[PDB]
Amino acid sequence: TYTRYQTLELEKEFHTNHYLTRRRRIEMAHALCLTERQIKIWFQNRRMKLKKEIQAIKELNEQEKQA
Ligand SMILES: [Cl-]
Ligand SMILES: [Cl-]
């Protein structure tokens, strides 16, 4: 799972940049005390979450622009 601090810090980083470099993933890994894999998955899932939020709004705006 992910602690209150890990979540807050992962979100802070995510908003700065959705994609990380291998060097950055390492930095994050040591800082948040999560493995490279735990960071890699979190970022993939957080991108998946965003992709869905963007689509939901896109289709809400298409819906609300009728009649
Ligand atoms: Cl906690
Ligand atoms: Cl990553």
* Ligand (nearest to CA of 37): 2
Distance 17 CA to ligand 2 centre (A): 10
Nearest to 6 by CA among 35, 24, 50: 35
Burial class (CB in 10 A: 0-12, 13-18, 19+), 54: exposed
Radius of gyration from C-alpha coordinates of the chain: 15
Total domains in the chain come to 1
- CATH code at position 38: 1.10.10.60
Distance 44 CA to ligand 2 centre (A): 7
- Identify the domain containing residue 11 by its residue range: 1-67
Technique that determined the structure: X-ray
SS3 54: helix
Which residue type does 48 have? M
Distance in angstroms between the alpha carbons of the first and the last residue of the chain? 46
Distance 4 CA to ligand 1 centre (A): 4
